[PDB]
Write a protein that binds this DNA or RNA. Structure first.
Ligand SMILES: [Mg+2]
Ligand SMILES: [Mg+2]
Ligand SMILES: [Mg+2]
Ligand SMILES: [Mg+2]
Ligand SMILES: [Mg+2]
Ligand SMILES: [Mg+2]
Ligand SMILES: [Mg+2]
Ligand SMILES: [Mg+2]
Ligand SMILES: [Mg+2]
Ligand SMILES: [Mg+2]
Ligand SMILES: [Mg+2]
Lengths: 88, 70, 271, 119, 101
RNA sequence: AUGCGCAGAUACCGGGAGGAACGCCGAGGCGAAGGCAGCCACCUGGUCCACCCGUGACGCUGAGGCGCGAAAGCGUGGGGAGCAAACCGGAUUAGAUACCCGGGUAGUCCACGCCCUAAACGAUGCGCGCUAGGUCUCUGGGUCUCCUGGGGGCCGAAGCUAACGCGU
RNA sequence: AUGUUC
């Protein structure tokens, strides 16, 4: 599982300002963590189609978040996708 | 008779080694007693069954003992 | 697994080839224990005595170790698993800590790197050999002696084994590969585990060659011969048996039992 | 031939028959009987009267082994269970104790279809 | 890293030559898998509620420990290997949950 | 009756194997559905509540597409105790290609890959708001004799309904 | 236990 320390390392790293815990960047980085973590589990456990549904959800959630960002501020959409290594 | 809960003081129903206490939730055939006899909540009863089984595996309580006199 | 092919030819549409994953490990054989010349020859002093043998690839015999008691209490480490063209099983090259090297037949599960040892105080784990009497009943066991000290004769073919069913005197009872229940002396050695490369029985040969590659020449039916040759010989165009079906030599060949009647070894069988 | 004062009396009472085997205290059968050892045949073996008869015939055969007392162990739902116990109590043989030891899966094998109108 | 209670049941019929052997094998194994024993409790010989390894008794141990969670199964595999070790239950340690106050 | 049984069965006891399913707890609970039941550990998804802390409409639905999808069934392997289509026997019958009995092969189990159906049902698409209450129940929160959220039931206001019924 | 039709 993600530890309380591990999750906070991501949040600091992505927060637009200290005490920023929501926010499209933090959210989308928080999800990416989950998604990569969970993609790796599915790698070993191909047969766990229940957890997979959740993946599909997160992927679609992040997709939605990123679409919103790309729409309001397109530079920090790009800045983020880069920083996180996604949309490929 | 009474409820079994109504019989003991402050006890921990995660403790799969208090066989002294647990055997008391167990009927004369080794069967986990129903709530009408343990007088536990729904939630308590589940914590209980879990630890009773853990204990049965450890060897402390029976999965089944036999009914005496027909 | 078994390697399948796409139908690029006819024949290949059906061939399946053994999976040699368990082997590669070592792919030439051990110069020292390996080669004996193995004398090919489909028949005896002159005469074919077993039909339809011959041709087929040259082979070195790999001397293998069918009596394990020579080497009680000397551990050996499993160096290699290798192909043995002279048996369905594959074999395990053992480096004894003596120096000495031997080939056991490779049991299912045996891993290169493992250690292995023979004798009455040997751990009950795969590839150790023990007198049957020292082995927990219900342990499944391959390469078993039938009489003490006469070498392993039971359960050596790929994927075979026997199970100890019980003890009873100086004898144990094995269920054999065949399903026969036999009494086998407790002093008889056996090695713990099954033989493996158990996929062996599933390889589809696929073509008429291939049989040929394995030293199996065409088998001609008795029907299809003339009556000089065989009980089913003759009849004008294609004919049923017309007799209870028989070998060339004339015994019946559907159901007639042949193990010798009065054989002392019967006292000890049961299936 | 042998000699055992105390032992066990097993009652096995199916729906089709009642059979009692009496054993030494290590459980080794000393003697047995059943609905069919007594005269009965077919559906009447599962009758309670047969069980009575079986239990006494079985009790009786164990005088010859010098049996005095038995622990009774019952296995079965089935008509004969009750009477075969009564038969034993008042039989000469003294029932030290009764025990139902009926084998019962902790949900296990799939039953034959006839025991599986089941949901 | 999380707290587990490691239960162990040994052959009652050991002598402390034999027992300490096992007890040391378990100690060496614990430490091997990075298990830092906190509490420990040799309740010892008990009458089991059913026979185990044909034996009416089990000698009982209990080790509270903190170890990496990803090594816990592998440790229980190892602790079991030995013959006189006849049960091993490893259990994530839990807050107690009471009835009555 | 077939069948098993004097080559010693049945019942009892000891030793062992092996497969399948988990009694009591156990009614409720979880999941989008299919569905999910011993215990332990690791990995992992959904979900509820509280603080009211962050973002600031980022939302609803969704033709196609993608994935999931009981049981049977198919392919390659494994496994095979119990059960058991087909099948063999015994009965029943006017016949009995059935129902009842004794056996029994696929299959039922596992891995991988297919199939993609169903009374796949609440025969009720999803989301949001609004319109009495009472009562039982699961699971959070509470200056806790009641309040407050999330679920599951039964009865019912208004209203709807061909009716049956539905009704926060 | 079975036990058809108009
Ligand atoms: Mg002739
Ligand atoms: Mg002819
Ligand atoms: Mg003709
Ligand atoms: Mg705010
Ligand atoms: Mg399906
Ligand atoms: Mg299926
Ligand atoms: Mg199949
Ligand atoms: Mg078919
Ligand atoms: Mg039948
Ligand atoms: Mg429909
Ligand atoms: Mg209503």
């Amino acid at each position: 599982p993600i530890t309380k320390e591990e999750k906070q390392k991501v949040i600091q790293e992505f927060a637009r300002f200290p005490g920023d815990t929501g926010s499209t960047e933090v959210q989308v980085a928080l999800l990416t963590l989950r998604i990569n973590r969970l993609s790796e589990h599915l790698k070993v456990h191909k047969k766990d189609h229940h957890s997979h549904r959740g993946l599909l959800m997160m992927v679609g959630q992040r997709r939605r978040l990123l679409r919103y960002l790309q729409r309001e501020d397109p530079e920090r959409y790009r800045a983020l996708i880069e920083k996180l290594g996604i949309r490929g | 008779k009474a409820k079994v809960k109504a019989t003991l003081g402050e006890f921990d129903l995660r403790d799969y080694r208090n066989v002294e206490v647990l055997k008391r939730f167990l009927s004369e055939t080794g069967k986990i007693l129903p709530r009408r006899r343990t007088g536990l909540s729904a939630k308590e009863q589940r914590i209980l069954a879990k630890t009773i089984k853990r204990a049965r595996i450890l060897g402390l309580l029976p999965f089944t003992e036999k009914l005496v006199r027909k | 697994a078994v390697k399948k092919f796409k139908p690029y030819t006819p024949s290949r549409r059906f061939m399946t080839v053994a999976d040699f994953s368990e082997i590669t490990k070592t792919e030439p054989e051990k110069s020292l224990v390996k080669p004996l010349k193995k004398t090919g020859g489909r028949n005896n002093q002159g005469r074919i005595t077993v039909r339809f043998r011959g041709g087929g690839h040259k082979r070195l015999y790999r001397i293998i170790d069918f009596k394990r008691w020579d080497k009680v209490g000397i551990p050996a480490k499993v160096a290699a698993i290798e192909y043995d063209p002279n048996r369905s099983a594959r074999i395990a090259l053992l480096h004894y800590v003596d120096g000495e090297k031997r080939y056991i037949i490779a049991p299912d599960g045996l891993q290169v790197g493992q250690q292995v040892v023979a004798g009455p105080d040997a751990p009950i784990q795969v590839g150790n050999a023990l007198p049957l009497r020292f082995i927990p009943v219900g342990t499944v066991v391959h390469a078993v002696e039938l009489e003490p000290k006469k070498g392993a004769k039971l359960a050596r073919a790929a994927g075979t084994s026997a199970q100890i069913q019980g003890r009873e005197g100086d004898y144990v009872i094995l269920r054999l590969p065949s399903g026969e229940l036999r009494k086998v002396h407790g002093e008889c050695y056996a090695t713990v585990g099954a033989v493996g490369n158990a996929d062996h029985k599933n390889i589809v040969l696929g073509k008429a060659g291939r049989s040929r590659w394995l030293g199996r020449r065409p088998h001609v039916r008795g029907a299809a011969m003339n009556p000089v040759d065989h009980p089913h010989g003759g009849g004008e165009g294609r004919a049923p048996r017309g007799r209870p079906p028989a070998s060339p030599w004339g015994w019946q060949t559907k159901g007639l039992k042949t193990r010798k009647r009065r054989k002392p070894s019967s006292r000890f069988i049961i299936a | 031939k042998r000699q055992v004062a105390s032992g066990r009396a097993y009652i096995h009472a199916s729906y089709n028959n009642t059979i009692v085997t009496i054993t030494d205290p290590d459980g080794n059968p000393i003697t047995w009987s059943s609905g069919g050892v007594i005269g009965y045949k077919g559906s009447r073996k599962g009758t309670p009267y047969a069980a009575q008869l079986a239990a006494l015939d079985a009790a009786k055969k164990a005088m010859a082994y010098g049996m005095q007392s038995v622990d009774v162990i019952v296995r079965g739902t089935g008509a004969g269970r009750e009477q075969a116990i009564r038969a034993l109590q008042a039989s000469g043989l003294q029932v030290k104790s009764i025990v139902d030891d009926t084998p019962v899966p902790h949900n296990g094998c799939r039953p034959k279809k006839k025991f599986r109108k089941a949901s | 890293m999380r707290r587990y209670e490691v239960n162990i049941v040994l052959n009652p019929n050991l002598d402390q030559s034999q027992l300490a052997l096992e007890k040391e094998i378990i100690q060496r194994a614990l430490e091997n898998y990075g298990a830092r024993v906190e509490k420990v409790e040799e309740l010892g010989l008990r009458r089991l509620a059913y026979p185990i390894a044909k034996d009416p008794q089990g000698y009982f141990l209990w080790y509270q420990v903190e170890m990496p969670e990803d090594r816990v199964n592998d440790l229980a595999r190892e602790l079991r290997i030995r013959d006189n070790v006849r049960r091993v239950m490893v259990v994530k340690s839990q807050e107690p949950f009471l009835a009555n106050a």
